[PDB]
């Protein structure tokens, strides 16, 4: 029997069947509730909308993400999202399918305990399993060695692997991702006059970010160039007409990944935490880590991010190593692709957590063994 | 030579000389133009009236504020108001006094650039400077640490400051203030029969708001009490006789500050944005922020707003912190008082933007360095 | 003329006068610099704060230790810390006092060369001397024979002494100490939901470590006991409220000293390196070494560390020897106490490195004779 792969993420649910090339259902991980009165008697108003139905009706709803920084902070909303994913998007019965969920590294244990308890009780999956996103990304990249930099909507983390062995003491987790860049852009757009305060307006700004922002190779002279001429200015049209034009914001928004002090954080840029995670590894494997930086996730999709990353790491590493940033063109779904590959392996069918093991050991089995 | 302090605000100009205890000129920031015909030949009708001269000829004029939400949206009217402030209220020559202007945080750059250009070109000030209203409010409160909540006529904002260091990533700006409460009161008074639609009638309703409205410590049982008895009803006499009596409107008008959903806004109340701004600061300074909530501006002058604010923040914060709301009895002029203190400091006389620096750098001098 | 004792260490400066019973000044060896903006004109902004002044303002500063693993890696910051120690804490003139610095064994020569050059040039001490921490700890213990395990903030080392003769081929130096335990605890607390990433939060976690952590006599059954009941859970209150409760982390943190594989190190626990350093000595003195294990430094202050140490060494050594772990109650200042005793000996006054010897021989005089 086929299995389900349900990479959750903090901004997008990507589900599908183990053995496909791409996720079958990709929709926002969002729950909307009506905000206004409701006067038309007989309209049949729902209590809440999920997925991308809540996205087209977003004008009258208040949107909430049930996952903040990789952690599930609203379990009823997460249950709604899973119910939707199973019954309306994939149109299956969860009782007939093992499910491979995914989770960021180095986040609380109650998260996985609640995941597995929810699955086994309110969905009656025959078996399940909770992988780590970076490992699956490496599976999808077709490698067994490399330091993968995953950057989605909630959390950015490095995991260095060698020959299929993880270095759990060198795993570095950072908490600025797509959503903090969206907020920084919402804050930077006000200095031109545009004011986005609603959650629907946050979605609008997210789309502006996904369409017009890029990473400058050299930040300072890019700034000076944008100051001198006006060739960097593009235009965007809100969904009511009323075009807006942005200039240096285009590269000031994603630059925060390399100077997290823009949003008042004390951490270092992603280049520097990658270098530190490498320099925390055994001196023999780091020459092979330098040449297998695997970029993953949506927040790594800016134009020019691989070149800036390579420039920075080359400036940090010794002048003899060969820095290679590996950025596939489909790197936004690498975690799901690797998850499907993993759940399709024959030697994996003993790694599931069967219903009987859960019945014997309680929800605590998820990390105690698997 | 003495300097001028010209806290503009969106509802009231407060000007004076640096070194005084209180502003010398306080008049409405308003420009009126006649609507009707004009039949008496030789009456000598002016083209437009500004300040409180437009407030006495209110009945025949149409009033307009050149500042909407902290942003100057009519630069000719703002030029008129500044010309008035200098030549008729203060009765000075702007060519012989540096000028300290004030502005809310997180508003467009063109606002400051135009302020600077106007001052230097069409008033020939020797120097100028554009402070932030919250910093000056803290100066006037006599402390170097605290989260100040300024709420004037156009905009409400929090600025957390510690030991003289601002936390610009935790500044939160909200766009409901005195004027939105005035409009909500104009709309809520129609359910008793009173209909104010004119701009003059908007001024009347503003006076009603300043004289009869208060914040209820507990909104629900206050509502039930007003429903039960009639001990909350007061009476007001319009300027033609015609007494009006209002009941629960008295506390339903300023309640919007704590439930901005009454006017269809999605934001949170001022208590909740204050708490969020605090919880966005470093864990070591927020205990000292919890005990120095400084209130400022006119919209914080309702009877019982400090008690409700303290109750709400106490309900939100941990049960060990000491929540202290600092509400001086003169907090309506805190920005001007702090501005005079600042402009009087000896160590400040190098922070001015001299005319020569402007002539060198252009209007962009203002935010680029000062 | 009296002399100064300046046990530097990598986490705490302990200074005083030769002849006292305890260090006169004990403050963190830390230098903080402001990261945020600074708005209040005239607040008197300092460029950098040192010592425990940087500890109270740590909410707005970024803290840095100029000593990483016993090695001074920032000589400007170390010069700042020494200047502070002499002028603000001890309030003396370094030109009138010989200074006894201290260093860990088996660290680069340039460290001592730069120490003595700094002293003689930018402080003009009349003479100086650089001792070894373990020897001074043995002085303070009142012995001439024993294997001393010193464990501070940066480095752990054993030095076996017999009849006042060191065995330099049996000195073993290990590079996990208090700071690596603090980092491991910061990483282990994330699996309960608490997230400390800032340097100030690292100080908070250090205090949690110093208040709630202990060494379990038997790690496995202690683990099972913590899993069974909940009697091991204590609660801590962060400096903003927000009570946190930790369970088996209390003894999982210092257990790393006995299983350095928890932080991904390949070495052996402190018990095993102690036993190895003993078994590297001549077969006649090791019976007297077995009974004079002298613990020293702050990291040896966990409750129950002496008993675990004795149990482990007893299980390793032959079943006839008498293992005695000597753990004084003031063992956190043994190095300074012994240094004061040493600098007070009359026969020591010929071992100083006079200014004239340095002027003749260059900085290389320090290790070349003394």
């Amino acid at each position: 029997t086929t299995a389900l792969v349900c990479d959750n993420g903090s901004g997008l649910v990507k589900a599908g069947f183990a053995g496909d090339d791409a996720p079958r259902a990709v929709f926002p991980s969002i729950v909307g509730r009506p905000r206004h009165q409701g006067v038309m008697v007989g309209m049949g108003q729902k209590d809440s909308y999920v997925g991308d139905e809540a996205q087209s009706k977003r004008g009258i709803l208040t949107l909430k993400y049930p996952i903040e920084h990789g952690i599930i902070t609203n379990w009823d909303d997460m249950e709604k999202i899973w119910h939707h994913t199973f019954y309306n998007e994939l149109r299956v019965a969860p009782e007939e399918h093992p499910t491979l969920l995914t989770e960021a590294p180095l986040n609380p244990k109650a998260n996985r305990e609640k995941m597995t308890q929810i699955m086994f009780e309110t969905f009656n999956v025959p078996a399940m399993y909770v992988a780590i996103q970076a490992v699956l990304s490496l599976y999808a990249s077709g490698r067994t060695t490399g330091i993968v930099l995953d950057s989605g909507d909630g959390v950015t983390h490095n995991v260095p692997i060698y020959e299929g062995y993880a270095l759990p003491h060198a795993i570095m987790r950072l908490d600025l991702a797509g959503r903090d860049l969206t907020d920084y852009l919402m804050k930077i757009l006000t200095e031109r006059g545009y004011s986005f305060v609603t959650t629907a307006e946050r979605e609008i700004v997210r789309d502006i970010k996904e369409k017009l922002c890029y990473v400058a190779l050299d930040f300072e002279n890019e700034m000076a160039t944008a100051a001198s001429s006006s060739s960097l200015e593009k235009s965007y049209e809100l969904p009511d007409g009323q075009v807006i034009t942005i200039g240096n914001e285009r590269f000031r928004c994603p630059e925060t990944l390399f100077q997290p002090s823009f949003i008042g954080m004390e951490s270092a840029g992603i280049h520097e935490t990658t270098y530190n995670s490498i320099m925390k590894c055994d001196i023999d494997i780091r020459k092979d880590l330098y040449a297998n930086n695997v970029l993953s996730g949506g927040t790594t999709m800016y134009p020019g991010i691989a070149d800036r990353m390579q420039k920075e790491i080359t400036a940090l590493a010794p002048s003899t190593m060969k820095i290679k940033i590996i950025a596939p063109p489909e790197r936004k779904y690498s975690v799901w692709i690797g998850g499907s590959i993993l759940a399709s392996l024959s030697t994996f069918q003993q790694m599931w957590i069967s219903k009987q093991e859960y019945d014997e050991a309680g929800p605590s089995i998820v990390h105690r063994k698997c | 030579t003495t300097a001028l302090v010209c806290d503009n605000g969106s509802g009231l100009v407060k000007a004076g000389f640096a070194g005084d205890d209180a502003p010398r000129a306080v008049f409405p920031s308003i420009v009126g133009r006649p609507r009707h015909q004009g039949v008496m030949v030789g009456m000598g009708q002016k083209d437009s009236y500004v300040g409180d001269e437009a407030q006495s000829k209110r009945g025949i004029l149409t009033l307009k504020y050149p500042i909407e939400h902290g942003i100057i949206t009519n630069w000719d009217d703002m030029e008129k108001i500044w010309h008035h402030t200098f030549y008729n209220e203060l009765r000075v020559a702007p060519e012989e006094h540096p000028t300290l202007l004030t502005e809310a945080p997180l508003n467009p750059k063109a606002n400051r650039e135009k302020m600077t250009q106007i001052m230097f070109e069409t008033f020939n000030v020797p120097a100028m400077y554009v402070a932030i209203q919250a910093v000056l409010s803290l100066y006037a409160s006599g402390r170097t640490t605290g989260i100040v909540l300024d709420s004037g006529d156009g905009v409400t904002h929090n600025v957390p400051i510690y030991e003289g260091y601002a936390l610009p990533h935790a500044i939160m700006r909200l766009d409901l203030a005195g004027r939105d409460l005035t409009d909500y009161l104009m709309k809520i008074l129609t359910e008793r029969g009173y209909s104010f639609v004119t701009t003059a009638e908007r001024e009347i309703v503003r006076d009603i708001k300043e004289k009869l409205c208060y914040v209820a410590l507990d909104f629900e049982n206050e509502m039930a009490t007003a429903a039960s008895s009639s001990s909350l009803e007061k009476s007001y006499e319009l300027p033609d006789g015609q007494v009006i009596t209002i009941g629960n409107e008295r506390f339903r008008c300023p309640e919007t500050l704590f439930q901005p959903s009454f006017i269809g806004m999605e934001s949170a109340g001022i208590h909740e944005t204050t708490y969020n701004s605090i919880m966005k600061c470093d864990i070591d300074i927020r205990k000292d922020l919890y005990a120095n909530n400084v209130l400022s501006g006119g919209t914080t002058m309702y009877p019982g707003i400090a008690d409700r604010m303290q109750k709400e923040i106490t309900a939100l914060a941990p049960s060990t912190m000491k929540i202290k709301i600092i509400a001086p009895p003169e907090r309506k002029y805190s920005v001007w008082i702090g501005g005079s203190i600042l402009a009087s400091l000896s160590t400040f006389q190098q922070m001015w933007i001299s005319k020569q620096e402007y002539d060198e750098a252009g209007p962009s001098i203002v935010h680029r360095k000062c | 003329t009296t002399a100064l004792v300046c046990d530097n260490g990598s986490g705490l400066v302990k200074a005083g006068f030769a002849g006292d019973d305890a260090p006169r000044a004990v403050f963190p060896s830390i230098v903080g610099r402001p990261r945020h903006q600074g708005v209040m004109v005239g607040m008197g902004q300092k460029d950098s704060y040192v010592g425990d002044e940087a500890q109270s303002k740590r909410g707005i500063l970024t803290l840095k230790y100029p000593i990483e693993h016993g090695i001074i890696t920032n000589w400007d910051d170390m010069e700042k810390i020494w200047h502070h120690t002499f002028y603000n804490e001890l309030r003396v003139a370094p030109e009138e006092h010989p200074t006894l610095l201290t260093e860990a064994p088996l660290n680069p020569k340039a460290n001592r060369e730069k120490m003595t050059q700094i002293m003689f040039e930018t402080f003009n001490v009349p003479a100086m001397y650089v001792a070894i921490q373990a020897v001074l700890s043995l002085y303070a213990s009142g012995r001439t024979t024993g294997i001393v395990l010193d464990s501070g903030d940066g480095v752990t080392h054993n030095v076996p002494i017999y009849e006042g003769y060191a065995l330099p081929h049996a000195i073993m130096r290990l590079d996990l100490a208090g700071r690596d335990l603090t980092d491991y605890l910061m990483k282990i607390l994330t699996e309960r939901g608490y997230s400390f990433v800032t340097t100030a939060e690292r100080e908070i976690v250090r205090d949690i470590k110093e208040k709630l952590c202990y060494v379990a006599l038997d790690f496995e059954n202690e683990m099972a006991t913590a899993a069974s009941s909940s009697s091991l859970e204590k609660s801590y209150e962060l400096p903003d409220g927000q009570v946190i409760t930790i369970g088996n982390e209390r003894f999982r943190c210092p257990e790393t000293l006995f299983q350095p594989s928890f932080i991904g190190m390949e070495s052996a626990g402190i018990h095993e390196t102690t036993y190895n350093s003993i078994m590297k000595c001549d077969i006649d003195i090791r019976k007297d070494l077995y009974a004079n294990n002298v613990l020293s430094g702050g990291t040896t202050m966990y409750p129950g560390i002496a008993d675990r140490m004795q149990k482990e060494i007893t299980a390793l050594a032959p079943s006839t020897m008498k293992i005695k772990i000597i753990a004084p109650p003031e063992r956190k200042y043994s190095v300074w106490i012994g240094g004061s005793i040493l600098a007070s000996l009359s026969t020591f006054q010929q071992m100083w490195i006079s200014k004239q010897e340095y002027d003749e021989a260059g900085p290389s005089i320090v290790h070349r004779k003394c």
């Binding site: - | 410590l217 019982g304 008690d307 109750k311 | -």
Partner: protein, 59 residues
């Protein structure tokens, strides 16, 4: 308003005070009994050490 506020708050303060006091005296009982227990363990250990050294001399 503020008076009844502070009154209810600090009556609850006296509530948690009574609770924390109960826990205090319970911890005092715990402390005294634990002193007695470690004292019994102290006589245990003194006796067993006397036995050990005597019988080891014998051996």
């Amino acid at each position: 308003h503020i008076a009844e506020d502070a009154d209810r708050k600090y009556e609850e303060v006296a509530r948690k005070l009574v609770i924390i006091e109960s826990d205090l005296e319970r911890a005092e009982e715990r402390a005294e009994l634990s002193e007695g227990k470690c004292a019994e363990l102290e006589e245990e250990l003194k006796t067993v050490t006397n036995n050990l050294k005597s019988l080891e001399a014998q051996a």
